[PDB]
């Protein structure tokens, strides 16, 4: 499936399977918050961001 | 009550946070008894009574 | 384990602090429950070698 829908256009469609355990996420990888501790804003953040 | 106790009218964003806004008398016209007589309500007819 | 906890908290933001501002402890009741105990254990040491 996620093959297939490599030939639609303008669409990131991709399939995936559930995790083991639907109560939680992925659970692979790592998950990291970027904060913005001193009130720059959205547009500072998304530049720190980028 | 506004001139002389301070109403929160609505809150603003400050650097990205939602603070309060006030409306309060400037501290010098506000700080005797005598001071009551020179604050003025608009009647309905448009002129100002003491 | 809320004063560890404080503690703790207050060293995360420390980093982001502006030019000077600075973290003063001028009054906090929990070195006397620590130290006073932390007495008690070497009287209990001091007892044994005794």
């Known amino acids: ?50 | 009550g506004a001139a002389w106790g301070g109403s929160y009218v609505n809150d603003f964003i400050d650097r990205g946070r939602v603070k309060k806004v006030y409306v309060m008398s400037e501290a010098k016209y506000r700080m005797l008894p005598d001071d009551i007589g020179d604050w003025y309500v608009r009647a309905a007819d448009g002129q100002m009574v003491p | ?50």
Do not use: C, W
């Not at chain 1, 790592?30 to 959205?42: N, V, Y």
């Not at chain 3, 429950?33 to 001091?46: A, D, G, R, W």
């Open chain 1, 1 to 50: 499936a996620t093959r297939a829908f490599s030939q639609i256009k303008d669409a990131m469609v991709f399939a995936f399977n559930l995790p083991a355990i639907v109560e939680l996420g992925t659970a692979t990888g790592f998950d990291f918050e970027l904060i913005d501790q001193a009130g720059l804003g959205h547009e500072k953040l998304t530049q720190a961001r980028n």
């Open chain 3, 1 to 50: 384990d809320t004063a560890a906890a404080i503690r703790a908290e207050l060293a995360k933001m420390e980093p982001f602090f502006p030019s000077g501002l600075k973290i003063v402890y001028p009054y906090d009741t929990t070195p006397f429950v620590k130290i006073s105990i932390h007495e008690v254990v070497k009287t209990l040491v001091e007892a044994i070698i005794l």
